[PDB]
Design a binder for this molecule. Sequence first.
Ligand SMILES: [Mg+2]
Ligand SMILES: [Mg+2]
Ligand SMILES: [Zn+2]
Lengths: 99, 268, 1362, 79, 49, 50, 49
Amino acid sequence: HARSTGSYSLVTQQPLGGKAQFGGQRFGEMEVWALEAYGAAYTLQEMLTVKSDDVNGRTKMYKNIVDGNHQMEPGMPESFNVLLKEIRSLGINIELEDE
Amino acid sequence: RVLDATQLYLGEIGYSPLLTAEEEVYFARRALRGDVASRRRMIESNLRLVVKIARRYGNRGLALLDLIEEGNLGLIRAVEKFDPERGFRFSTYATWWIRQTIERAIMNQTRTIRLPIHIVKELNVYLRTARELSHKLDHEPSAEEIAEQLDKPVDDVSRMLRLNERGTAVDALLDILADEKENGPEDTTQDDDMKQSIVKWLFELNAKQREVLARRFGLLGYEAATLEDVGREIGLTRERVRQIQVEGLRRLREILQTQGLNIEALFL
Amino acid sequence: EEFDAIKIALASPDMIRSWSFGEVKKPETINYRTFKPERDGLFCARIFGPVKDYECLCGKYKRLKHRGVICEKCGVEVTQTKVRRERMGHIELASPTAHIWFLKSLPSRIGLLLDMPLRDIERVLYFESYVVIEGGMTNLERQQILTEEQYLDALEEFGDEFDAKMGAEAIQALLKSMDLEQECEQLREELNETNSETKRKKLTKRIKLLEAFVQSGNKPEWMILTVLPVLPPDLRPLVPLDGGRFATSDLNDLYRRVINRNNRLKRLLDLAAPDIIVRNEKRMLQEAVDALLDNGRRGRAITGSNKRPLKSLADMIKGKQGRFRQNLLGKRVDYSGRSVITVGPYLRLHQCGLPKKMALELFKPFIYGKLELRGLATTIKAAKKMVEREEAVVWDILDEVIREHPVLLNRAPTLHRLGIQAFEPVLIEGKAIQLHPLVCAAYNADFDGDQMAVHVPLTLEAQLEARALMMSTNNILSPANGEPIIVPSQDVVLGLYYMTRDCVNAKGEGMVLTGPKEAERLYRSGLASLHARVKVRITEYEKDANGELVAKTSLKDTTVGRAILWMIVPKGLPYSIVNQALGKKAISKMLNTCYRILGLKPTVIFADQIMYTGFAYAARSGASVGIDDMVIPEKKHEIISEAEAEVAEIQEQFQSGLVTAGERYNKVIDIWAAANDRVSKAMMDNLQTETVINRDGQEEKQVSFNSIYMMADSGARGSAAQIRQLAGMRGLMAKPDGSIIETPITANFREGLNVLQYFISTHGARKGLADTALKTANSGYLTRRLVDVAQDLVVTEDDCGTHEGIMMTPVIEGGDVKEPLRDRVLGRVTAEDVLKPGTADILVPRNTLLHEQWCDLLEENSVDAVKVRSVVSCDTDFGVCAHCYGRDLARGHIINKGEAIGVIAAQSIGEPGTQLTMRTFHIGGAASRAAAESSIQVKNKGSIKLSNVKSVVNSSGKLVITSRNTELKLIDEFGRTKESYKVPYGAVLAKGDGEQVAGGETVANWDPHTMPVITEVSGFVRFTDMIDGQTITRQTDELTGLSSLVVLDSAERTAGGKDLRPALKIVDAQGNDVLIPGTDMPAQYFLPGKAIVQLEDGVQISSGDTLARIPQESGGTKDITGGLPRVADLFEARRPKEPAILAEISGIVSFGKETKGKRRLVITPVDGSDPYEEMIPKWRQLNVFEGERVERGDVISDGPEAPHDILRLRGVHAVTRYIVNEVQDVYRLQGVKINDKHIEVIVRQMLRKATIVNAGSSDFLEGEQVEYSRVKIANRELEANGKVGATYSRDLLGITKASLATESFISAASFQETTRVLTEAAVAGKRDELRGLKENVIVGRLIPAGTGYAYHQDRMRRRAAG
Amino acid sequence: ARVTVQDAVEKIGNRFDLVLVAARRARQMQVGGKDPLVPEENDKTTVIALREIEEGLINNQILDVRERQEQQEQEAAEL
Amino acid sequence: GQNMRVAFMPWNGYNFEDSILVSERVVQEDRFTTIHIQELACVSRDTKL
Amino acid sequence: DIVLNPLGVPSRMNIGQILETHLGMAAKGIGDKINAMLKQQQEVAKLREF
Amino acid sequence: RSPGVFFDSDKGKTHSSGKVLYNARIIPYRGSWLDFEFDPKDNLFVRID
DNA sequence: CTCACGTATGCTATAATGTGCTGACGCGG
DNA sequence: TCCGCGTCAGACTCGTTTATAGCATACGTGAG
RNA sequence: GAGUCUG
Ligand SMILES: [Mg+2]
Ligand SMILES: [Mg+2]
Ligand SMILES: [Zn+2]
């Protein structure tokens, strides 16, 4: 099984799992740590952002790769925006403090 | 260590006075005249009755406590519209009210999507009929067999049994399901290519042809107008607009035959 | 948007209102017919937004033209549908509702704040009982509970002027009325007057809470909810399945519960209902909200449809499955694929076979891109249809894209970093991934169906990080050790072995060749065997003093297969490398040597060549396995019948009376264990040689070329242990308990196993297989705890300029030095300039890397001890210096600044455990454990050196030792330590201190089974407290009657004997107590659990005699199963059940008080006048005697040392070295090589925090716990400026707590205990500035390490300006 | 190089900085269309930057110096 | 299954870790050729439209 | 037909497969003798003997 | 587990005292379980269900 | 501008008035 | 007594069974 | 959610 781009999950916006759902391979904690041990910071961010949740990022980077730019332009992973909403639903004020 | 909301409440109800016939009449006359204590005592004394009906009304929609509270609302309406002048007992009249309010609540709250009682009542008759059919027909009721027995439309019976199907929990099933309202990057990228090509296509055809064609479909303009509505801009014509719209499209059809689409992008 | 930090704080009712875009009044979801959102329902479009993009509900406004146009008719904003994922609502609660998280979550904030027990609060909340909020009349004070009837009494008598209420209104009032300031001062006043030890903690904790509450600006009333927020619809979606049915989140069921009960409460309030009913509704409302927030915490969770509890808000965040672990610290990924792996022996080391169809799909955008630049595709949809049609031109384009583009291969489980590697792909027809053999080791890849993930690095940056950092070729050495991972195996080994190994004469013995080319010509011509012992002329190239290679040529006896291998061997290497018969062990050394001399590209080429030649000659040989291979010894049946009549004689002696079950078990196991070794050694002599080959004339002996023997000797597959079971005797099998079956299997596989032997086998087998499934998870949980603790640790500085460091000495554990000083200090920064013996000329500087060249010099001079710079002693704040660390073991040079060291450390500790779990378990059947260690024989002549020893001379003439810690050493002439030998207690020494012994002399004998209790004094033996049935037991014999006494411990003992310690007391002939030479102690030896005394009371003993024998049953397996819990216990800094005691201050000590037997050791120092007085157990016996001038941290007690007490008294290097050695003991027992520096990283992370005494210029005061780096920073500015000086004391934290003590709550939450972490952060108003790695990975940003360290340090300087 | 990047690490030193510098140069050729100093030889922008670093033509300092130069020439043209 | 002429011996790494080297003759003789029958359904439903 | 790796036997300690292989060849040995006698027709008496 | 009686014992476990606490468990096919057990102080206890 | 359609709140009267599945994990703080 | 922890991907299947009165006026929006 | 599985 192989996948470049496909459908994406409902809440988390991450790609689905399994070959029947045309799914992306799970990049697990273990696999992340490996990139952490190495240097590989761009490979990791890619895997976190334009390859998974980052909605704007993934489309923008697709366009760049057909345009042959091979530039990332990262964003904010959508699972996080949900996390925030789920913690505010608990009645905890969790704000982003700006620069 | 009594912590449970239910056991606490049932402890409190047991702690009440039980009413007699003459007592019910005395309190009921004072109650309708508008006594505070009389209303309180009649309600509190008859809470036990709510519980007996609510206890046999569980495992159908809401919880016992939820079924007892809604049942209590029926008790209040019962005390308000009780007639002590009629020799007939209160328990008999109250039972109607308690069952009515519990049933009504169970028909509304239980389903996530608000369902009308009109359809629910119809459904009841269809299901009771199915039961009698099942006892004699060793098999189960068909839609047509139920419809035959009630002398009603097959389509109407099917619509009703179609609303019987309950909802399923996503929590998992969530991960199998994928966003259908959100298009994929590949699809969104394809729309970007088309929208960008149009701008370049507008400055490739004639100046009056790409003006009239674009502002009609709402490509360059703000509002998607029709052949007759293109007259508002500067065209102010009906025949000349229709000849020029199609003249723009005919020259563009040859631009797609030469670039390498036409029948190639016809499948799409 | 781009932000600095994140803060968390309690939500105000009004704050909650801010986020809300309306109050959802109704439970209505959607209309059954028009499946659109209902009025002011849960999916209301008027509140959360439009269902369709830029379209109102009633449909009046459409298209992107209408922007923010709120439709007047339906009341729906024309914006994108996206908004319905972001907009929140709210619910107006009739009754105030307590927030379960602040109530139930321990310790609890509402309870701790009110100083009111939880029970009291709950009685109030469920409306069982009233609570007093305030009474001016002290009659009833504050927070005093009144029952229904208690409320009636005061209400008539006082009433009115006293306020007492019920439910959450009461608690909210109580919280509103409480003044944080005033209570802070009152509690400070209490601590000043009478600070009781344990309640000082609790008072200080409520003080910290009150202070932190006021600093956070959180209000206690807000713990009670008046407004209840509503989650946006799309985050609790109602979607139609294909079947026409709908599917929804359980949050919808919980919100509908809450709304129904809340609205019913509004109704019953409008109707003025009697209060019993109001109360029930308020209980039900609190139940519904508590279910909605956190279901299952408030008791029985609300079961929905199946019976399963509804998933609540907190359940979506909390669990491993929450959102942290599942959707945030790891994710599903685009441009990712998998398939089965298979060999690619043809590949070079930097390549991998990637299926055509798989690669077509992964590089889809890259194809689209080139297709449009060539003008072959007019647009993207036409390019997609050309790929769909899989046109011939598309393959050519795809070949062009993949060129020089690296792909990541990953295998589960990813234990260490080499579980991901980058390769350049090679397009292949067929559906399987082709993996290079030499990297199979790092992946632990075996091709019996394993699969791999493929991932495509998209950006130029990611491509470069893959090619430079993650490439196969570039990750040759293990980062856990200095040994390489890429090493030829199987055929690659068998073939090179076949080539190098020599045979007698064969074809063309003793010929002469002109170089390896005449040799290869001869072999391939068929005039020479590869084992033709002939001399060839090979030209070696040795490196001189300068870079130049010096030419050298000479003749040397060898074979015809080794000369031909020389052709593969790169110039620079000696010919002696190929001149031995090569195995896997020798080839690994060969590739490491080549890497360190020649460098990376040469070793890469050389590795490929070795693989190619390996299989090339592997197929040329053609070795197989027959039934004649395993040759069982002629003398098996003799050895067995001998062993068998012997065990029979001991079973007959069992009914007689010299034997317990334990004694005979040991004796039978010993007999069979020695028989098995004998039969095995018979088989291996008979098989290993027993080659009669006639040399050129007469007969000779040489090594056997029997197939199985070659397989074993080469190290290709089976070991001698497996071949014992094939050809020798199968041996003693061990039950799933670990206890060994008394009847061994006499037969082998060749002979045939029966149903009984096979059935007995099964036990061990299945326990092994169950072990792999079940045990794998504690290993992995340890990796994860380690990783979390040492995530932040990054190389920050190049040189801190520190002199400080740990003294490393050769690790000579047992008899032979498994790992010397060179291996232990190999690649380590040297500090405090350490020269040679003669102190008159510096040999090594104080800022240099310990390279193999330096290391070789160290060995000529025989330097034993070297202070080296370590991670633990590094001064760098918020990371560690390249010099303190030393070499990146994976690179073979000094570590690069920015490398994430902690992660590598945790992974490298974690991996072996997790791998040795699955590995040794499926692979072994029986338990080949040895236990011959019962008598020291010395290997080399020398003089006996006994350090730490106190022994008594027995009537034999012999030195019987009675010390616990005893270290016999073997000194030579010059006076160096070379052999060590742990003498036990109860030992007979042959010779006493400093006496000469020759090679192969026995110097001490002791029994391994039984640790005897050996008496110092001579006299008569008295039975103290040894009441039969109470404390001991009596067991009698026949004819005359020998009774034997067994000391029942408190386990079997009656209530009556519990307080009695049973002990054999030494009295003299008079029946007075005999003293222990020179002290006031009377002789008395306290007998432990099951101390089996033979000789009954009143027997004249001589000194040095065995009184009592304590059964020392050692029925434990020699696996990681038993080792890993020891490792986890050290890392988590657990005090044992019997930790040793050490002096706190230097100075002179005498004894004071005693509690019956319990010692109250009084230290009264010389200069420091204050005493230090300790309570000590009675039975714990002291090493020190009385008045000695002992320094800080002198060992007083026996048994195991607590790492806490080591750190606290001796210090950092002491405790670090204790952990390193005690952990390494376990891993070394399993043959696992991990560098100390990794363990040292994690210990540094353990010693992160420190407690403070006194104040400085900041807010320290008594006993705040602050991180060490931050207090050092304060101390640096303080010492320059002055102000109040602050005494500090470093604290040890074991892993789990250390990770939770990190000053990032995003890391704390993601680890564990998320509910508790977020309540404590919310209450403190804590602000996470996102400094660590986990924090950055969560927000999906650049890691502060590796590639990101450049960018990250640029942002930190952008903080200074702009 | 083609096979292994050891030589290019030996020029700059820090593997991490090697990657940044090769990235920056590859981006120039990818976007700006900067001409390669070594013959392309059908090599991707990733490998060409590593060749240029190996031979010691490309470097963080050198790239910065030429950035200033082109940027001051553009300032000159604007004024 | 099917019995086969098997030889125990290395090949050029084509039997590395349990990897199996098979003759073309096995494929020709259609031995270990296997038959699989997949079931696909198409459902005509009734919708609100 | 198939070439399997010798090194996946002595570690695995499934010696059954080797005995199966020796006997399998012996079984097929006798099948090859019967095949040879059937190709040359020969006697029912002789086949019966063997 | 077949219904009937079973006599079992925590082999240590509870109380570092290391006392073997004996227990009986009566298991029916249908009904509440009847437990008897010892306490460290040798008092016989009953746990119904 | 008017009626039909969808949805809801109403009232009826023998007396009846007190509840209620799966159980057993193991180590630490 | 209570509550905080327990390896990493992959394959497939099943599942969301059951219950309740009848007819009059009132409340409210939509369609022609 | 309960399965039968491959490392
Ligand atoms: Mg495997
Ligand atoms: Mg094995
Ligand atoms: Zn509208």
